């Protein structure tokens, strides 16, 4: 599923991401935009052989099992394919664990390079929320 901007903002809000560990909703929408272009089906291979999955590009190196990332962890206790559903529940719940692990949203490369320190409120402009 490719979400609209305000559609994703609403889904993220209902799932408890607005101000989760102090990160406003706009941060999460911005991160999803630049990680997956709002596409739940997005997958991308990393140089180490792990893969990033879904709307928030969650990586198999630490967070999920994709059956092809040897010597990795599965800290969200999920198959990576779960992160590809049209419904974002699994991605959100796993993201909450990631953002809580010590590094905050810096875990998301796209967030650190494209959202951090910008006017992220713009990402929810005009959205009925
Ligand atoms: Ag949902
Ligand atoms: Na893909
Ligand atoms: Na992989
Ligand atoms: Na994801
Ligand atoms: Na893994
Ligand atoms: Na940018």
From Swiss-Prot:
Summary of the function given for this chain in its UniProt record: Lysozymes have primarily a bacteriolytic function; those in tissues and body fluids are associated with the monocyte-macrophage system and enhance the activity of immunoagents. Has bacteriolytic activity against M.luteus.
Sequence ranges assigned to domain C-type lysozyme in this UniProt record: 1-129
Similarity-based family: Belongs to the glycosyl hydrolase 22 family.
Primary location: secreted
Reactions mediated catalytically: Hydrolysis of (1->4)-beta-linkages between N-acetylmuramic acid and N-acetyl-D-glucosamine residues in a peptidoglycan and between N-acetyl-D-glucosamine residues in chitodextrins
Tissues and organs where the protein is expressed, per its UniProt entry: In the egg white and polymorphonuclear leukocytes.
Cellular component per GO, a single term: cytoplasm
UniProt name for this protein: Lysozyme C
Assigned EC number: 3.2.1.17
Disulphide linkage map: 6-127, 30-115, 64-80, 76-94
Keyword terms, alphabetized: Allergen, Antimicrobial, Bacteriolytic enzyme, Disulfide bond, Glycosidase, Hydrolase, Secreted, Signal
Gene3D superfamilies attached to this UniProt entry: 1.10.530.10
Highest taxon above the source species: Eukaryota
Organism listed in the record: Gallus gallus (Chicken)
């Amino acid at each position: 599923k490719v979400f609209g901007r305000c559609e994703l903002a609403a889904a993220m809000k209902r799932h408890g991401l607005d101000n989760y560990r102090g990160y406003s909703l706009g941060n999460w929408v911005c991160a999803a935009k630049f990680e997956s272009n709002f596409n739940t089906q997005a997958t991308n291979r990393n140089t180490d052989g792990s893969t990033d999955y879904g709307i928030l590009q969650i990586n198999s190196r630490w967070w999920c099992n994709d059956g092809r990332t040897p010597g990795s962890r599965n800290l969200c206790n999920i198959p990576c394919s779960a992160l590809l559903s049209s419904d974002i529940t699994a991605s959100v719940n796993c993201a909450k664990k990631i953002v809580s692990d010590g590094n905050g949203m810096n875990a998301w490369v796209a967030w650190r390079n494209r959202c951090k320190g910008t006017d992220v409120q713009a990402w929810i402009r005009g959205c009925r929320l």
